[model samples]
Target: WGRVLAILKAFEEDCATPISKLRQVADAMTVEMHAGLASDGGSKLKMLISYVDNLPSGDEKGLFYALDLGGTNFRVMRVLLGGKQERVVKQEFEEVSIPPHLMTGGSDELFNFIAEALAKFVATECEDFHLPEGRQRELGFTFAFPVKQTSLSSGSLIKWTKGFSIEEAVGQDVVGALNKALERVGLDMRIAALVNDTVGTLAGGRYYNPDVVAAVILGTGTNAAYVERATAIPKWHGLLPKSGEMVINMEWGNFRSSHLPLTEFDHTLDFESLNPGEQILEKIISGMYLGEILRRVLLKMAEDAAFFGDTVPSKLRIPFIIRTPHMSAMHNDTSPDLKIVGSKIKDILEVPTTSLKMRKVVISLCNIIATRGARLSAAGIYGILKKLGRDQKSVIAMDGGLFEHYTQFSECMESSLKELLGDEASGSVEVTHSGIGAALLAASHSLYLE
Candidate 1:
């Protein structure tokens, strides 16, 4: 019991993020954002120019398709726009999971699977859908990883993230690969735009709300995108587009700093991860690792405090067995006896019995981890505002399961942003779906462009 208190006290100290520290994090983000835009290869934040200088204006009328392959599950969507009057009048989508074996297979093997699925989806198009007699099908490929762009319809893959590892696909033109697959499948579709999730969200958000100056994603991982004046991105030596503002994809997960309050648990986790010493900020702030962080802390309690009794319940020692959603359930459990917590501990850790007091301890651990994530996420958003000198009044569109489902997590992030901006903060940051965002990006790069 005494040992448990000591462990809790240690974690509290490590996770205590006061107002001052948050400001520093925001400042660091601003600095890193600048460094990234100043050059191509030196900064931690990639700050990749989205090439989508103009966002969707809500008047995009046509039949458009978006192939979103950024996550473990891929989504195929078709949106029919009725111009500015009734935007996005009708939509249909299907989400399919990528098999584990296909994740590491030959590029052709993986893409062929995707092409077949897309063809199957196209076969279901109803008569209500209208493709102009002379027009070919247009698709927006939301690649959702880092890419070096030559234009809207083409970009070379930098590398794979989200556990994808096809060595052959690594430096190839992603759009071209998709094009070939479409050709082989007899699906006559042409690639229009290749964008990341962040850009997609911004384009989708902007179609409805003109005030949405930025978009932030807090799902399995975290990243952001915002409108930037072409003159501000010094590394972009080419001629600026007519819109004058370009969307910049800030790959913020890799952000690191001496000021970051990294603890021993974080250090150990990073050292043992697949990409050691990389994506330190993401390791701390992303949904993919938050549950594991709390699990490590609990493991320490089990080892030193014997909190779960003598045996240590072997399953509790396993990494990521306690997923973030499970932690979320325990955190949101409001029963008088904390029955949900007890049930979770019993089922997930194989620990049969736990006193009400220990259940509360478990809940506290979840809060600490989630609160830190929420706070850091706020700081990252504030940093973007500071760089642009924009007000909190400008809306920032956010999407992801973590922000959407976890009520407390989203609340804390909003409150922290309020604290950081103080009197200057009068706007709201709320959950929004990027359901139509990728399609809009596709529409932007489509043949309908004036």
Candidate 2:
């Protein structure tokens, strides 16, 4: 017998630990994030001087477009807003994939390709989508990577970290690079505002709906951005915004703290990672790290417990083989024989034949990793709420495939948050998926229009 029930209990505990451990991780991340934002030096995550407030209100209306260039996909979207009473939005979206070589090669090549796609989208514009006569269409460029924004429309690409090798783009103004490409492709669109996906998401969520206070990304990596009071920024010497608010991108992943409970496996993985000791918060709490953690645990299980029959698959050692998508596929398997998703693991990681019990364990591991991420995310949201004094009747605007696809993860997050917040407080907190928050960001960044 495989001691199936004992493994099951461990599996459930692993999955559920996030709910119990949320308070510690949440506080660790919160304190570190604030410390990182300190004008004076402090031992916390850095790269932010948090002083933004008042998100883009959809009152900034007429016509706006967005281009979200994140990992794996690039999207072009348009939105038409009708202000308050006509609160609902009318929008359209389309996406394209980058050529694999461009992802790792020259910057001009990638930007040029993106510009060409934007040109194509422009070519398809209909009469209903007015371009305000002669005014060149303004676009919000949603660059889905880490950046150091000096303003809404300009940011310095601090070394490309997300599996990207745009050496030419490093240290260059990303918006300027896109502009050069637009000129080359004959597109007349103005890059009005440049922002990261987290900022864009916050704008999008807050523009139309006023309830959202903060934004978080739970996909390949983790990050958060929030609107803060302009007066709070001590590092800024220039004229403060008359609008009373500015959006600060909190590069929360780079946050590290001794308070975080890092297991032995986590320490080993961190020591071996490309950016060792950096992004410690993200390494143990993002979808990108979840499968890897599972792999580490399973690697031990395979070698010692004979879980994989005396051999670990070569693919298992490969990077990113156990993606969240694969984890989801296994979790969703309900076949009487569980034949429906057996190949998912084999195809993704080249694992061997296994009984339903084995697949269930994999699902359990998936549950553990994803639940931790989601619950931590919830805690981060709670911290934001605590800061905003909007701890009740709250809303969180979230993006990324991890939150969108992983239902159980989202639910567990919601449930765990309630556990911490208690029934009364939990009733007021809400997590909503922002379908077109990017487009709304583009609208908010339309400095040229209105």
Q: What is the C-alpha lDDT profile of model 2 across 1-450, one tens digit per residue?
A: 165445545645544554546676666666655555556356445535322334666565667778888767888877777666554456777888767688789988898888888788887887757677667687878887666666667777875544567777778888888889988987887766777778778777876568777788878778888776666555554546787766767777776655555565577778877667677777877767777777776665666566667787777676666666777776677776566457876677667687776776776667667776777777777666665655545677888777888788778777877787776677887778762554555555555554
lDDT (Cα atoms) of all candidates against the true structure: 0.84, 0.69
Candidate 1 — which residues are off by over 4 angstroms? 427-435, 448-450
For residue 237, give model 2's deviation from the true position in Å.
Answer: 3.8
Where model 2 places Cα greater than 4 Å from the true spot, the runs are 1-20, 40-44, 47-54, 85-90, 130-132, 264-272, 334-337, 390-392, 435-450
The Cα error of candidate 2 at residue 77, in Å, is 2.0
Model 1 lDDT on a 0 to 1 scale: 0.84
Error of 1 at 74 (Å): 0.7
Residue lDDT tens for model 1, 1-450: 657988888898888888899999999899999999999986999899878888888878788988988556788888888888988889999999778788788988777887999999998988767666777888888877778887877888886665567889988988888878888999998777888888888888888888888999888877899999999999996657998999998988888987777778888888877668677888888788888998898888898899888768899878778888998999999998899999999999888889998888899989989999899999999899888886334778898778998888999998898888886454444435544776777776677742
Q: Pick the candidate with the highest lDDT.
A: 1
Residue 364, candidate 2: alpha-carbon lDDT: 67
For all predicted structures, in order, the TM-scores are: 0.95, 0.87
Q: How accurate is candidate 2 locally (lDDT)?
A: 0.69
Per-candidate clash tally: 0, 6
